[PDB]
Design a binder for these strands. Structure first.
Ligand SMILES: [Mg+2]
Ligand SMILES: [Zn+2]
Ligand SMILES: [Zn+2]
Ligand SMILES: [Zn+2]
Lengths: 475, 404, 49, 42, 97, 260, 46, 51, 51, 115, 67
RNA sequence: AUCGAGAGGA
């Protein structure tokens, strides 16, 4: 604890019943930081918090906190000998003392979660499989994967037009930089049965919201190519092919290519089009077409073309093509609670149900997705988000927080002229009649997932066949 | 076309469909035919095969079409029934106090394919003409079928006392000459079970009439649910303070009884029962204290519910959920088990480093005394994650061995 | 070389300097670039020695 | 001197912030590679 | 080669080598990149149907995320670091001795 | 068997919204008027873009989509212009569209906000609403020193049924029976619900006594304008367009009865 | 015919013929980008 | 025992309350790419000539 | 059961055990399917494993 | 890939007509009006106005499929009346209502702006 | 990456309010009070301003392709 | 194109 000869990552376990003292300095030991506890008292005093508050002036950092003997890294094997306080409230003298001999305290229990589970708001109000499914699906959510995406020639990349930070957030996301590169949009979710097009894990989206850019994304796809001069026997070269010299020329037109054989940026390209005109010298004479076509049925625009030399040093070309993906029926969307579903139908703003103040939901999800799944975090997030949007906040959905429960959120929401439980009177968009049931509606953070239907739809009728067995190809 | 979903488990996983060309780029399915395919719409994909000859087309038309597939030979009962929104909404629609106006009735009759064009005489003519939901479902019901069922909330002591044939709760479904004489329809009447209205329709009427029956229930009920609406929110997960404080009193019994048992075991006041070691008897005795607690708190939460509650609405209809789900959302999540036992001592005689050694109390071994609305404590959260991981492993490991 | 490691050219650079090399300041590093492809080493569990 | 409960909920998060100001999220990768280059190769 | 393919071992022993090390970094979204950089892997073999190594052990508390795990064939074998988890880099025991 | 005799009472009229009450009409008529506010009131909006140069950090479709959503003053011009379907010209002409140019280049160090004020029109009547002679101008794109955006747009006539950019409303509040007298809603717990702004009840009373013989009358509207039209112009256009749809339907109906 | 490219480092206009190694003649940088085409691509602002 | 086949299509499934149970809603693109070989007869000569 | 009572006894008992496995979770399968499985399993005078 | 143009919902294809009238042989004095490229906006008002006619025995409408862009209106009248005549009178009454509403809204604006 | 032009829900213009919103925030308004000053009644438009992340400001830290 | 690997989806 003094940063003397023993470094911080050294584990020192005393098994008492068997008289071993096992000291470990090797690598690969997973450990975590914990607050040391005096007799029944944190060593972390207000002086440490004060110095930490001005961390940017007096260069008082974490590593001084460790050097002060206030924090300690404990490995899994040494936890067996440690008596942990979940919070300093456990250190507090009680009518019946549970332990009274604690040695360490959690900094915060929410640090048991990882990167993707630290995104979930109110994860302790969900069934745990739902938290696992979200931790999986946050990795398929679109956003801005990195700030310098304009210069990266990634094979596949999805960028959301209008990423938003969640209105209801956890205090862990401040370190995941989710606020700075968020992967979703706050959507006005109504949980309702409306026309039957959201049944069995499906959603009804607002066509008008989609027209305004709601969950619109851009898909970037990069195509490689290189002209190999491996030997005088045969050499490839980028050049606009010609019908008179090239042998394996498809019937697709090559007019979009330039002299150099490379398409130019800003050119609209449809499926089966040519972006690189490459010809290889033969042993329809003395050169055969080996051009690069678009991956079929894409219909994008050439975002940019880069030319350079590879390691060995022949020409090398990268072409990024850009395709705007507007959400549509069959695109998969998810909240942060394992509630995934495809778009069942899109209604225009006049067809959607509306509140007395003409707010239509961006998304309508079916109430039958809640009861078996027990994703109460979804409902609490919706209510907290209504409070946050009406109050001008960002809600605190950190997992284990006794200063935030459903009652106090409901009391807050009732102060803004809303039903305290997040229900509203909606009117049928088609007829304008009030719906007899008051619908639960509010802001919820939704995610657009990589799984778009246009990348999955496929059909065949007498296409190509495999060489070995003359059967249809795969994929 | 043959429409198929993988894994192709039984003969209803590949059925014949007639093609309907529609704008966007997905395969659009009816909602009753999702249960045979085990299909939902969270990104599922399905395969379409087009027979290429009149021979095979006739074969699929006469053998494999969906209406011919309504009743499965596996369990002599329908394989597809009425499903989520239509089932919740038909439960709400056939309640005794559903009265439809003239315009609403005409709007619903627009969606009956098998309608003779005759508006039925309203059940109430004065002071206002009002039709009932049973009166319109009677028009949906085909042929002249006869059926007796009981709604899921039917009390078991009602068939004995008076009011057998005039049910106070509008349970005891009676369809007679194709008219819903009485009762609230639900999973027991329109689901996949044996003797239901859909089964009896398939047996008495053909597969064509039953196809139309399915479609008509869905269209009429969905267009009525456009008026009625169905939702779920926080208000359905709340209970009154009486109920909360009953549940807390029950849990504090349960813990304080488990403490009783723990001292008896500690003082050797506890003797084994036949067929079990002392450890196993203590574990039984604690688990049966805590299951009594979980059942009692669940009962309290159930009785606290109103008939405006949407959790209850979906559980009575049988559309989705169960009473145990309501108990976990409102009352208490309960004991988390790993391999059928309480949470194991993965540390030295400890489930976590936050407990003292040799702590067999309910908290320590994975009893979640909170609801999902209350929120789990960090230890409860970890133990619940352990139990859910057990479920995920089971789901991911049974498939290979069952498929083999 | 693992990116943002001590022997990486991006080591100790400011957010200015990273942007001015066409690098994202929020990029954590921790991966290699082999043949232009970003490769990440997954920690491998093993039974202690 | 003592952090009272009313302050705890930001004392703790202040501490957590400092940790992530010092370490980050990929500290294990960078430290492993650094140790490999400084020690393991030699 | 070994960082490019992930086959961890000599190129000649391409079958005795253990693959899955050195994966292509997920750049779909920032969370996927962070998680992939904090990914741990238990080389028990996905073919194994014993649940014990896939169970969430009590000792994962504070070290590994209780929730983040693939729900397919590797459930509980591929894990993720908890946020404040730090894997020790190794040190010399001579000062201690 | 005959028409309603609806009455109107306008309770608020600003440049931003119109709050009015229609009284003695059917709920279907009221909702069709509400729907026409959103979906069948034509305005002018950019529906054709040609990017001559775009060095900005937003790709070309992003700029185009963003330009389409800028409201253009459509008050007197929208009735005069034709749909390009109906125009007997080529792709464009002044009788069916409006030209816009934008040509901005950031020369200084210091970030250039390409706003709707840089959208220069050939028609002085059809201009960006924010540019009209307070509220700032809609931000099209931020440009760094060396970046440049030069484009040529054409704005056309359409309504919200084709695309939300032709929707003139910024929210249509619609209400009826503020006190739940018709019981078209059924509150489980009527005391928990806040009162409507149009409610006429003492605070002890949660909802009005049930009216068995009532129907919906006295529908309350708050039509907020995005800026392209005035709200009263939105309502008058909506009434004309709904009517005038009905007239076209009548004409086709007469032909179809004739022909039988 | 000229097919002018831009430098990734120095952003310099420069013409390069075929069968020429790709290298900027300001600064020798190895990566070059094609200029935006001069055809007329139309966008519906939707 | 199993093999790849022609005249097959695959895509995401979506709800449709307005289809009968025996109907499947299919895209124009799948239907335009999938074909059925219909034999010509005086019964269908004219219709098939339009197609 | 086969060794002690014989092929028809084990046919009956195997029916019984499969029915117990199937119905323990409240499920139901038509008896003709269990009967056909158990007959395939015993029609040759010995216990034929499904392997 | 499969997105219909947004104009399809309201524009008419060549050779397909706005409205088609069909006997309903079910019952006497009933007709089906299939109206193309309209939606709930006109269907609801026409149906409600028809429900005002005491000589109309049935008035209903449906959008058979939201992805399709037609409505069906079924009208049954008394034997001395006609569903075509009922439909015509309903449209005429709606037009007169909307004209009156427009004039009164103009007056109400007139008054609001000046007082 | 940049403030949307319209509110996704109602279609109210919010694209001219980001700069004013930031100016009000540095003027020591609370976020709610600032949203009230800009006339965003509805929690949808308040969502639009309150949840916006101005990523374009970071994208402008990179030099363009042409000088 | 083949092979292998990996990551994912239901
Ligand atoms: Mg599924
Ligand atoms: Zn013109
Ligand atoms: Zn250069
Ligand atoms: Zn809004």
């Amino acid at each position: 604890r003094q940063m003397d000869i023993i470094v911080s990552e050294v584990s020192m376990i005393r098994d008492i019943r068997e008289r071993e003292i096992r000291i470990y300095t090797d690598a690969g030991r997973i450990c975590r930081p914990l607050l040391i506890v005096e007799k029944q008292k944190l060593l972390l005093k207000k002086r440490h918090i004060d110095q930490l508050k001005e961390r940017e002036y007096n260069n008082y950092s974490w590593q001084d906190l460790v050097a002060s003997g206030v924090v300690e890294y404990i490995d899994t094997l040494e936890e067996e000998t440690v008596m942990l306080a979940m919070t300093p409230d456990d250190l507090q003298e009680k009518e019946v003392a549970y332990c009274s001999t604690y040695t360490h305290c959690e900094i915060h229990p929410s640090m048991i979660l990882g990167v993707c589970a630290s995104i979930i708001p109110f994860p302790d109000h969900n069934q745990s499989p739902r938290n696992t499914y979200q931790s999986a699906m946050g990795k398929q959510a679109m956003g801005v994967y990195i700030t310098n995406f304009h210069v990266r020639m990634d094979t596949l990349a999805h960028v959301l037009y209008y990423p938003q930070k969640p209105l209801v957030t956890t205090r862990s996301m401040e370190y995941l930089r989710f606020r700075e590169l968020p992967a979703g949009i706050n959507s006005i979710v109504a949980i309702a049965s409306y026309t039957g097009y959201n049944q069995e894990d499906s959603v009804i989206m607002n066509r008008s919201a989609v027209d305004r850019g709601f969950f619109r994304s851009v898909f970037y796809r990069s195509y490689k190519e290189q002209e190999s001069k491996k030997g005088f026997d045969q050499e490839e070269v980028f050049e606009k092919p010609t019908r008179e010299t090239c042998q394996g020329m498809r019937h697709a037109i090559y007019d979009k290519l330039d002299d150099d054989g490379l398409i130019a940026p800003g050119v609209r390209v449809s499926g089966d089009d040519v972006i690189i005109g490459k010809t290889v010298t033969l042993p329809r004479y003395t050169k055969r077409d080996c051009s690069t076509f678009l991956r079929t049925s894409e219909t994008g625009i050439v975002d940019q073309v880069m030319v350079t030399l590879n390691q060995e040093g022949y020409k090398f070309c990268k072409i990024r093509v850009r395709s705007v993906r507007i959400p549509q029926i069959g695109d998969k969307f998810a909240s942060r609670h394992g509630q995934k579903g495809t778009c069942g139908i899109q209604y225009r703003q006049e067809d959607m149900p509306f509140t007395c103040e003409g707010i239509t939901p961006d998304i309508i999800i079916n109430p039958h997705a809640i009861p078996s799944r027990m994703t109460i975090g979804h409902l609490i997030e919706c209510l907290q988000g209504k409070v946050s949007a009406n109050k001008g906040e960002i809600g605190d959905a950190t997992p284990f927080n006794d200063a935030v429960n459903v009652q106090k959120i409901s009391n807050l929401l009732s102060d803004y002229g809303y039903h305290l439980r997040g229900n509203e009177v909606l009117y049928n968009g088609f007829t304008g009649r009030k719906i007899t049931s008051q619908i639960f509606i509010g802001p919820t953070y939704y995610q657009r997932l990589k799984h778009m239907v246009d990348d999955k739809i496929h059909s065949r009728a007498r296409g190509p066949i495999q060489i070995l067995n003359r059967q249809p190809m795969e994929g | 076309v043959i429409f198929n979903r993988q894994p192709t488990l039984h003969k209803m996983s590949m059925m014949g469909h007639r093609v309907r060309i529609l704008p966007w780029s997905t395969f659009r399915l009816n909602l009753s035919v999702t249960t045979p395919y085990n299909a939902d719409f969270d990104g599922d994909e399905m395969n379409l095969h087009l027979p290429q000859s009149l021979e095979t087309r006739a074969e699929i038309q006469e053998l494999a079409m969906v209406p011919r597939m309504i009743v499965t030979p596996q369990s002599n009962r329908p394989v597809m029934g009425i499903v989520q929104d239509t089932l919740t909404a038909v439960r709400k629609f056939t309640k005794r106090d559903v009265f439809l106006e003239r315009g609403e009735v005409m709007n619903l009759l627009m969606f009956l394919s098998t309608w003779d064009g005759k508006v039925p005489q309203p059940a109430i003519l004065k002071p206002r003409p009002l039709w009932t939901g049973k009166q319109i479902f009677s028009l949906i019901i085909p042929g002249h079928i006869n059926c007796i069922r009981t709604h899921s909330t039917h009390p078991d002591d009602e068939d004995s006392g008076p009011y057998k044939h005039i049910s106070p709760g509008d349970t005891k479904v009676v369809v007679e000459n194709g008219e819903l004489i009485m009762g609230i329809l639900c999973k027991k009447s329109l689901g996949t079970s044996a003797g239901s209205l859909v089964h009896i329709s398939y047996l008495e009427m053909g597969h064509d009439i039953t196809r139309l029956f399915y479609s008509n229930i869905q269209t009429v009920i969905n267009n009525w649910l456009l008026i009625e609406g169905h939702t779920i929110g926080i208000g359905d997960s709340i209970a009154d303070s009486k109920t909360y404080q009953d549940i807390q009193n029950t849990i504090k019994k349960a813990k304080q009884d488990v403490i009783e048992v723990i001292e008896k075991a500690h003082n050797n006041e506890l003797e084994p029962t036949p067929g079990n070691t002392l450890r196993q008897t203590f574990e039984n005795q604690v688990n049966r204290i805590l299951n009594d607690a979980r059942d009692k708190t669940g009962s309290s939460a159930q009785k606290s519910l109103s008939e405006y509650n949407n959790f209850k609405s979906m559980v009575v209809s049988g559309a989705k959920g169960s009473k145990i789900n309501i108990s976990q959302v409102i009352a208490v999540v309960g004991q988390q088990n790993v391999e059928g036992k309480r949470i194991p001592f993965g540390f030295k005689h400890r489930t976590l480093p936050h407990f003292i050694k040799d702590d067999y109390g309910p908290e320590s071994r994975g009893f979640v005394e909170n609801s999902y609305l209350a929120g789990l404590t960090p230890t409860e959260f970890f133990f619940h994650a352990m139990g859910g991981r057990e479920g995920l492993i089971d789901t991911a490991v049974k498939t290979a061995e069952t498929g083999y | 070389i693992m990116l943002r490691s001590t022997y990486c050219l991006l080591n100790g650079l400011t957010d200015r300097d990273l942007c001015e090399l066409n690098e994202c300041p929020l990029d954590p590093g921790g991966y290699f670039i082999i043949n232009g492809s970003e490769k990440v080493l997954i920690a491998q569990e093993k039974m202690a020695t | 001197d003592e952090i009272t409960p009313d302050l705890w909920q930001e004392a703790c998060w202040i501490v957590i912030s400092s940790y992530f100001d010092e370490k980050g999220l990929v500290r294990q990768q960078l430290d492993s590679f650094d140790e490999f280059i400084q020690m393991s190769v030699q | 080669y070994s960082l490019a393919t992930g086959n961890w071992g000599d190129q000649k022993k391409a079958h005795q080598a253990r693959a899955g090390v050195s994966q292509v970094l997920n750049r779909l979204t920032f969370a996927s990149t962070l998680s992939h950089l904090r990914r741990l892997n238990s080389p028990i073999g996905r073919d194994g149907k014993l649940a014990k190594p896939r169970q969430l052990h009590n000792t994962l508390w504070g070290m590994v995320c209780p929730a983040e795990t693939p729900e397919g064939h590797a459930v509980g074998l591929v894990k993720n670091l908890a946020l404040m988890a730090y894997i020790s880099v190794g040190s010399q025991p001579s000062p201690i001795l | 068997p005959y028409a309603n005799q609806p009455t109107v009472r306008i309770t608020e009229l600003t440049d931003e919204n119109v709050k009015f009450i229609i009284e003695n009409t059917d709920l279907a008529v009221a909702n069709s008027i509400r729907r026409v506010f959103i979906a069948e009131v034509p305005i002018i909006a950019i529906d054709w873009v040609q990017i001559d140069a775009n060095s900005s950090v937003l790709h070309d479709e992003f700029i185009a989509h963003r330009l389409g959503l800028i409201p253009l003053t459509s008050d007197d011009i929208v009735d005069k212009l034709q749909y390009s379907r109906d125009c007997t010209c080529e792709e464009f002409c002044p009788e069916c569209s409006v030209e816009f140019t934008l040509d901005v280049r950031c020369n200084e160090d210091q970030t250039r906000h390409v706003t709707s004020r840089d959208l220069i029109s050939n028609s002085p009547r059809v201009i960006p609403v924010t540019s009209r002679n307070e509220q700032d101008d809609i931000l099209i794109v931020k440009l760094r020193k060396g970046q440049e955006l030069r484009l040529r747009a054409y704005a056309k006539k359409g309504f919200g049924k084709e695309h939300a950019k032709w929707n003139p409303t910024a929210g249509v509040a619609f209400e009826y029976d503020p006190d739940n007298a018709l019981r078209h809603t059924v509150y489980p717990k009527p005391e928990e619900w806040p009162k409507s702004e149009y409610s006429e009840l003492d605070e002890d009373e949660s909802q009005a006594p049930y009216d068995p013989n009532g129907k919906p009358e006295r529908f309350y509207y708050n039509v907020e304008s995005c800026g392209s039209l005035r709200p009263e112009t939105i309502v008058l256009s909506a009434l004309s367009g709904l009517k005038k749809k009905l007239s076209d339907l009548q004409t086709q109906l007469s032909h179809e009865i004739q022909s039988d | 015919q000229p097919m002018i490219y831009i430098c990734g480092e120095c952003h310099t206009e420069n013409e390069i013929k075929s069968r020429d190694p790709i290298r900027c003649r300001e600064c020798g940088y190895r990566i070059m980008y094609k200029k935006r085409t001069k055809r007329l691509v139309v966008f519906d602002a939707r | 025992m199993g093999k790849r086949v022609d005249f097959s299509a695959r895509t995401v499934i979506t709800p449709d309350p307005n289809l009968s149970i025996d109907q499947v809603g299919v895209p124009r693109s799948i239907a335009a790419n999938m074909t059925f070989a219909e034999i010509v007869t005086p019964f269908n000569i004219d219709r098939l000539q339009e197609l | 059961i086969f060794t002690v009572l014989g092929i028809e006894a084990v046919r009956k008992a195997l029916e019984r055990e499969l029915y117990h496995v199937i119905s323990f979770d409240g499920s139901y399968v038509n008896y003709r399917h269990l009967a056909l499985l158990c007959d395939t399993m015993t029609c040759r005078g010995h216990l034929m494993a499904i392997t | 890939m499969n997105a219909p143009p947004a104009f399809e919902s309201f524009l008419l294809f060549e050779g397909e007509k706005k409205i088609t009238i069909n006997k309903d042989t079910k019952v006497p004095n009933a007709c089906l009006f299939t109206i193309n490229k309209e939606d709930h906006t006109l269907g609801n008002i026409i149906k409600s106005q028809l429900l005002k006619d005491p000589q109309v025995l049935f008035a209903g409408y449906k959008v058979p499929h939201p992805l399709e862009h037609k409505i069906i209106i079924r009208v049954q009248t008394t034997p001395d009346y006609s569903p075509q005549e009922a439909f015509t009178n309903a449209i005429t009454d709606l037009i007169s209502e909307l004209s009156l509403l427009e004039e009164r809204f103009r007056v109400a604006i007139k008054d609001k702006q000046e007082g | 990456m940049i403030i949307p032009v319209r509110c996704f829900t109602c279609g109210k213009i919010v694209g001219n309010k980001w700069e004013a919103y930031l100016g009000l925030l540095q003027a020591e308004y609370t976020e709610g009070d600032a949203l009230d000053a800009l006339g965003l009644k509805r929690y949808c438009c308040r969502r639009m301003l309150l949840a916006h992340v101005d990523l374009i400001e970071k994208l402008l830290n990179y030099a363009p392709l042409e000088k």
